[PDB]
């Protein structure tokens, strides 16, 4: 993260025989694109989740600076 | 104050104190700058070479924000242009 | 009408300050923004331009206080990154510079704050308004100078590998 | 300009004159939302006691303990797991005892730092000077301390080393 070097966090993600809840086929990825559903529990993925919600805080928190407080600007 | 208009162009005091000052003749030329780059740093990063997650490229990005940017620039430009400035 | 640019017209925003008005400004930077914040903004330049070209000169010759400190100023930072100094005086940089914001915009709204005023004068080197304004035109020149110098610094130790001459 | 421990803002408009250990320093103008500092000085003065408290408690669990089993843990972080919950229950009623009646105080007295504690009468006979210097050394003092506090529990959180 500080490094910049950002595609490390996105590096070995889960596998398409991960069971939920173990450790078998899963991966060290914590912020990922894949899109689609878990192959098991038919769901999101938990790193799709966690990349939309880091994207999210950081859209906002950008946004939440429009308008003018006691500082001028 | 009275940022209000009725006329041809509002007033240069909706540029913010900042933009009210820039001449026309430098932010028109600035904007068509800042739209070209951006264009092409879009399709830099994308459309003419597919995106990758070991090719994000932070000019690209950044420059890709220059074409949202650009519209604002050549409003002001245009703005400024209108009032004589 | 200008003093450092015959040629081009004196500057419509400078017309006297003791940082060293000498009317350069071909572009009109002072037209767009306040002088009062560009003149902070080249005093801070001023500031860690001189602090960055004294740090790394000593640093390549003098600097081995331990093992950590084995470095020649290029590859020193990622290596002090990489050890945590960076990262205090980050972290009190930011502390500093968090209130200078607050010292940028109680100035441009009001107060008495002249531009790069921080006062801190502890051992007193002014005394009255004439040396203020000496060394305030001493601080910006040598500010200048440490800037151009410190550049050329980087670049020629990023374009080959050597010591002080580069 | 008017802060003396930021010398070049100016303070805002509530810090002025009284209320002792006033220095100036209110850069994000907190003090201009509250519509009197008598709160916010009691606050800081109750954390300032805690801290100082805490501050001691840290250095003398390090050295002393009590004569008991329970009690023999050095480090205080691990200490607030190993005593029985007995003991913190009981401190902790002792704390909401104490806490009740000076929450009917607090919200509405003119000075709700003061607590009428005086039992050996350390401010009996002193003038207003001695008084008002008494109270910036219990200000800057528990100032450090609150410092040195956080500065203990972050040193054993990330380290584990209780002390230096
Ligand atoms: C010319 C000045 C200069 C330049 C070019 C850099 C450049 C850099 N610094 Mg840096 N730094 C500087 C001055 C400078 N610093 C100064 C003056 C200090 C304080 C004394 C620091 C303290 C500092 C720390 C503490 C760290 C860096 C880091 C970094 C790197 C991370 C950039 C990144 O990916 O963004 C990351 C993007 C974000 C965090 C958000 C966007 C980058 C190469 C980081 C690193 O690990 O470098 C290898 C890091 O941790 N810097
Ligand atoms: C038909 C489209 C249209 C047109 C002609 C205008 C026209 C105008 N808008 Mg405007 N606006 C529009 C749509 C439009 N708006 C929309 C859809 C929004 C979002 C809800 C805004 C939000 C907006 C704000 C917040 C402000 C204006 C302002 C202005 C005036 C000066 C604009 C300028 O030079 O800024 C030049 C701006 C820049 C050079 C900065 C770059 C801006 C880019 C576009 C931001 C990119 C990030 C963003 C998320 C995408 C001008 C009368 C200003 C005004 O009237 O002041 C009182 C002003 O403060 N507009
Ligand atoms: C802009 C100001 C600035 C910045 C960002 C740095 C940054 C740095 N200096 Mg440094 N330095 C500076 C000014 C600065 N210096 C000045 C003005 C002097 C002269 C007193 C020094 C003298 C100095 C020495 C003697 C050493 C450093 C070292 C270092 C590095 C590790 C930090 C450390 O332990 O020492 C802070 C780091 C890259 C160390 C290092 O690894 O350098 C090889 C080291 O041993 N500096
Ligand atoms: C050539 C070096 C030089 C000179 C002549 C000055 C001159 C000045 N500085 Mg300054 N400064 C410098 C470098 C310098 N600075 C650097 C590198 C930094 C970064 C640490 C600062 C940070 C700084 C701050 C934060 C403040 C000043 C202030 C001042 C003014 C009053 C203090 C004084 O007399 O300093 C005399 C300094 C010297 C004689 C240098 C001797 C050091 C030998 C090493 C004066 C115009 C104050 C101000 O703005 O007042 C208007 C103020 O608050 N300076
Ligand atoms: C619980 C903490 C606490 C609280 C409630 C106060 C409250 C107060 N202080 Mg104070 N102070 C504190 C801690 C605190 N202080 C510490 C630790 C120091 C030493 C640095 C000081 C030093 C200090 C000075 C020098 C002065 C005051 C003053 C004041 C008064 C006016 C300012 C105000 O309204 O801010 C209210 C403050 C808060 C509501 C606290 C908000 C919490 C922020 C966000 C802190 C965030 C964390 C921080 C950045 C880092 C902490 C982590 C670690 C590094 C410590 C007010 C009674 C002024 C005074 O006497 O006026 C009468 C004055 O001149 N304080
Ligand atoms: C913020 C205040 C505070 C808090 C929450 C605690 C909390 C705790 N202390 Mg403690 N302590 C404090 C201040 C505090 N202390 C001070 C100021 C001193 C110096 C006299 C001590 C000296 C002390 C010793 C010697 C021991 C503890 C121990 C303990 C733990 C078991 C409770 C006990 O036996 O207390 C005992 C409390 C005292 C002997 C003195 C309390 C004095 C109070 C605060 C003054 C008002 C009455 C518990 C986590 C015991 C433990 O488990 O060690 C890790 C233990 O052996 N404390
Ligand atoms: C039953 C126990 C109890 C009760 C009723 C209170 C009541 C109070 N405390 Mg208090 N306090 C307690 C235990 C208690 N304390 C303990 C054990 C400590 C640690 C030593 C403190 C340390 C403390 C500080 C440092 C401060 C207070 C403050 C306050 C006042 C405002 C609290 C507030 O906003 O409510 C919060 C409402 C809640 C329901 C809190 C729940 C939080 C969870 C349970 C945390 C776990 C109020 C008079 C403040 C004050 O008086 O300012 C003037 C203040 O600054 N307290
Ligand atoms: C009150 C001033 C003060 C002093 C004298 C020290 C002193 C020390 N700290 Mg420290 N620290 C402080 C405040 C202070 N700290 C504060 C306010 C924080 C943030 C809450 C920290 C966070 C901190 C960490 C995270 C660490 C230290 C560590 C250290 C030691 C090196 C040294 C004993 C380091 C150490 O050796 O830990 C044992 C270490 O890892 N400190
Ligand atoms: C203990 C230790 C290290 C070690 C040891 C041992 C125990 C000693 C020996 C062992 O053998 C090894 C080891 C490792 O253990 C000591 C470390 C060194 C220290 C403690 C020195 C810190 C350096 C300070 C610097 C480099 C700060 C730079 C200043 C800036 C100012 C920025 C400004 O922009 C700001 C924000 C405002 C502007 O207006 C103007 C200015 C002021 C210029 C940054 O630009
Ligand atoms: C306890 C204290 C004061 C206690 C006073 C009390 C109870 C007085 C009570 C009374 O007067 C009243 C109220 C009313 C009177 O009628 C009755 C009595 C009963 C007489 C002050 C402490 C004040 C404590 C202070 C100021 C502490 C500062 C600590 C520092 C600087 C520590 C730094 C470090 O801990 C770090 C940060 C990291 C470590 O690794 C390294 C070091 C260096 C050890």
């Known amino acids: 993260f500080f490094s910049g070097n950002w595609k490390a966090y996105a590096q070995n993600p889960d596998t398409a025989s991960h069971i939920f809840g173990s450790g078998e086929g899963s991966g060290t990825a914590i912020l990922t694109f894949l899109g689609g559903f878990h192959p098991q529990t038919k769901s999101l993925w938990l790193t799709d989740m966690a990349h939309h919600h880091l994207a999210i805080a950081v859209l906002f928190i950008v946004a939440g600076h429009m308008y003018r407080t006691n500082w001028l600007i | 104050e009275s940022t209000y208009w009725e006329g041809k162009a509002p007033p240069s005091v909706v540029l913010g104190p900042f933009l009210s000052k820039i001449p026309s003749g430098v932010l028109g030329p600035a904007s068509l700058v800042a739209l070209i780059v951006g264009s092409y740093c879009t399709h830099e990063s994308n459309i003419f070479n597919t995106l990758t997650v070991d090719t994000i490229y932070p000019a690209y990005v950044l420059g890709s924000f220059l074409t949202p940017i650009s519209w604002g620039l050549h409003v002001a430009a245009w703005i400024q242009k209108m009032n004589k400035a | ?166 | 300009a008017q802060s003396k421990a930021l010398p070049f803002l100016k303070a805002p408009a509530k810090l002025d004159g009284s209320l002792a250990g006033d220095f100036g320093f209110d850069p994000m103008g907190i003090s201009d939302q509250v519509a009197n500092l008598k709160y916010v000085r009691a606050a800081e003065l109750k954390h300032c006691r805690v801290a100082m408290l805490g501050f001691l408690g840290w250095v003398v669990q390090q050295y002393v303990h009590l004569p008991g089993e329970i009690y023999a843990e050095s480090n205080p972080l691990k200490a607030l797991t190993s005593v029985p919950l007995l003991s913190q229950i009981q401190i902790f009623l002792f704390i909401g005892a104490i806490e009740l009646a000076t929450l009917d105080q607090t919200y509405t007295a003119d000075k709700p730092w003061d607590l009428g504690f005086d039992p050996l009468n350390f401010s009996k006979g002193k003038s207003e000077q001695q008084m008002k210097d008494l109270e910036v050394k219990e200000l800057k003092n528990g100032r450090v301390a609150m410092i040195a506090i956080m500065g203990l529990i972050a040193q054993t959180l990330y380290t584990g080393v209780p002390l230096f």
Not at chain 3, 5 to 17: H, K, N, Q, Y
Not at chain 3, 34 to 55: D, F, N, V, W
Not at chain 3, 72 to 93: M, R
């Open chain 3, 1 to 166: 009408k200008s003093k450092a640019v015959p040629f081009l017209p004196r500057p419509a925003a400078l017309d006297g300050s003791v940082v060293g008005d000498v009317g350069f400004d071909p572009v009109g930077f002072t037209s767009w923004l306040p002088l009062s914040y560009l003149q902070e903004a080249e005093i801070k330049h001023c500031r860690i331009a001189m602090l960055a070209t004294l740090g790394w000169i000593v640093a390549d010759f003098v600097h081995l206080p331990g093992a950590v400190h084995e470095v020649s100023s290029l590859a020193a930072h990622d290596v002090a990154v990489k050890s945590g100094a960076l990262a205090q005086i980050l972290i009190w940089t930011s502390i500093a510079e968090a209130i200078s914001v607050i010292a940028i915009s109680q100035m441009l709204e009001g107060s008495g704050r002249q531009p790069g005023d921080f006062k801190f004068d502890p051992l007193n080197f002014a005394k009255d308004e004439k040396s203020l304004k000496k060394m305030q035109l001493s601080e910006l020149k040598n500010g200048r100078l440490a800037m151009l110098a410190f550049s050329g610094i980087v670049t020629q130790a990023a374009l080959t590998g050597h010591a002080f001459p580069y």
